[PDB]
Every structure is written in C-alpha cells, then in structure tokens.
Amino acid sequence: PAYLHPLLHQNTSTLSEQRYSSTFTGQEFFLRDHVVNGQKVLPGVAYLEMARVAVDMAAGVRTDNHSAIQLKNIVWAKPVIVEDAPIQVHKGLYPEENGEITFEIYSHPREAEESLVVHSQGRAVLRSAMEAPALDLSAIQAQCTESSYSFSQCYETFHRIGLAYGPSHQGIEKLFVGPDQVLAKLVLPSSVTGTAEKFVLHPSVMDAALQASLSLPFALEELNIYSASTAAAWALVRYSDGNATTQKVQKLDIDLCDEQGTICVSMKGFT
C-alpha cells in the first residue's frame, strides 16, 4: 500500500550500497496473470520498469540535461517465481566513473540466505529528454498483409504452448504480419487501467509488445523511453540487421507508438 512503486516498494540503501527492496505476494497482477508452465513468474518487462524507476529515484533531483533515462546491455538470468510464501526482490544500483549506472536485480535464496541469485543486470544512461521519432502507420500496416490471425489465435497457442496469460496480460488486439515484420494492435486490459498511471513502462503493454514477437528473453542491447508506454496504441517488431538464425535465440527490434505513429518506447537489439 505504501509502496514507492508497484515494483519498487522500499528504499533500503546503506552507506555501502544504494538499494531498493520489494516483497511480492502471489496476488500481484503481473504475477497471477503471467503464469508460465503453471508457475507465477516475474515477466521480463517488469525488470525494465524496476530498473528505470530505481535509477529515476536513486539519481536525485535532476537537471534537464539528466532528466531522462536510457537502459543499455540488459541481461536476464534465473526468473523470479512466487509460491505460497512471498518473495523479496532487491534492486541494486552501482555508479560507474563514466557517469553511467550499473544495476543488479537479485534476491537471497530461501534455500540459503548467504547464497545469492541474480535475476537481471544492466546499465543506465542519463541524458537530455528526447524528442519522439515517428513511424509510418499507413504503409507499415500495408506491408503486413499475409496470414493475419486474431488475438484469440495468438492467445490460443499461447495457452497451449504453456503460457497461461491472465486478463491483465491480454493486451494484443490483432497481428498483421509479412515475412519480414509483425505489426500488433495493442490495448490496455481493463483490469489494470486503474493502475496504468503508476507505470512508465507498463508490464501489460510492454509484455504485449514482446508477446507480439512470440525461445525466452535473454538479453537486450538498448532501451529508449520517449514517453509512457501507456500512450502506445501500436507496436512494430522487426529483426535487427544481424540476419542470424542460430538455434532458438534471435536478435530483434520492438517499437511502440501512439495512434499518430509517434514512437514512445523503442527496444533495440532484443534477444
């Protein structure tokens, strides 16, 4: 209730370490409605919001020259899973000499409070606020005319493939695809509209952007925030120009834009 943020509850910083802590019950919407293979698993897109708001607050009152946050070189390790007992997640920030901020998202195993498990790591950059780029909504939709499928068709396999998305994570409206890209109409589930205000990178919309692509998120090269993900009405997914099939891991680009095509959130070098 008195949380600083639904994903960043409490500031637990010491003289040695800048740190934020959150205790998650199974009931949070981004857990109860994000069940993979039967377990409540923290979604990859929640780590980004966790990281952003930690940086936003850990950096003090800021000048226009530092009043914007960008994330770089994100990594994903073991996921956070919730059972009958709550799970405490720690968000650690470490300032580097070049003015960038390294962040580690970790926890202390109930198996061993002296052992440690890292779930994600990355870097953040403070820059001047960025003017939003623009996308071509009319033509891009026109380049995605082959084998369109309903959200339900997207949704049916998702449930069948082992990903049981609850109502809070049913943000895709429809998929328009060509062999080169996928453009997804997006919507905010009505359940989470009451709390969409308290997110910049909203897990429902951000995950819907990731859902439109789909083995699992493994890394992200860069994340740019021009406006709230809530403003988004469309999202475009494309391969990064690496052209490597490899095994089951791929490098992809994902962008969010509003009704006019103005990009508000863009993700580069996904993996």
Contact residues for Mg ion, defined by CB under 5 A: 112
- State the nearest-atom distance from the C-beta of 232 to its own copies, in Å: 30
- The entry of Mg ion, its own copies, none near residue 13 (CB within 5 to 8 angstroms by kind) is its own copies
Indicate which residue of 5, 9, 33, 34 is catalytic: 34
- State the nearest-atom distance from the C-beta of 134 to Mg ion, in Å: 40
- The entry of Mg ion, its own copies, none near residue 68 (CB within 5 to 8 angstroms by kind) is none
Cβ distance to its own copies smaller for residue 32 or 108:
108
- The entry of its own copies, Mg ion, none near residue 112 (CB within 5 to 8 angstroms by kind) is Mg ion
Element (H, E) at 104: strand 101-107
Cβ distance to its own copies smaller for residue 21 or 141:
21
Active site residue 180: no
- 129 to each of 61, 173, 226, how far by Cα in Å? 15, 30, 7
**Which are the contacts of 75, defined by CB distance < 8 A and separation ≥ 6?**
120, 121, 122, 218, 219
Q: Are 210 and 186 in contact (CB under 8 A)?
A: no
- The entry of Mg ion, its own copies, none near residue 182 (CB within 5 to 8 angstroms by kind) is none
Alpha carbon distance 270, 195 (integer Å): 27
Q: What are phi and psi of 160, to 5 degrees?
A: -70, -35
Place of tokens 């962008």: 255
- State the nearest-atom distance from the C-beta of 1 to its own copies, in Å: 8
- State the nearest-atom distance from the C-beta of 77 to its own copies, in Å: 24
Residue 153, helix vs strand vs coil: helix
Query: Kindly report the CA angle at 169 between 75 and 258, in degrees rounded to 5?
Result: 85
Indicate which residue of 5, 119, 169, 207 is catalytic: 207
- 261 to each of 132, 150, 176, 240, 250, how far by Cα in Å? 10, 22, 16, 20, 26
Cβ distance to its own copies smaller for residue 60 or 179:
60
Cβ distance to Mg ion smaller for residue 116 or 134:
116
What radius of gyration, in Å, describes the C-alpha atoms of the chain? 18
Alpha carbon distance 200, 49 (integer Å): 7
Cβ distance to its own copies smaller for residue 65 or 148:
65
- The entry of Mg ion, its own copies, none near residue 58 (CB within 5 to 8 angstroms by kind) is its own copies
Residue 39, helix vs strand vs coil: strand
Active site residue 207: yes
- Identity of the residue numbered 118: V
- State the nearest-atom distance from the C-beta of 197 to its own copies, in Å: 22
Chain residues binding its own copies by CB under 8 A are: 1-2, 10-18, 57-60, 93, 95, 101
- Active site positions, annotated: 34, 207
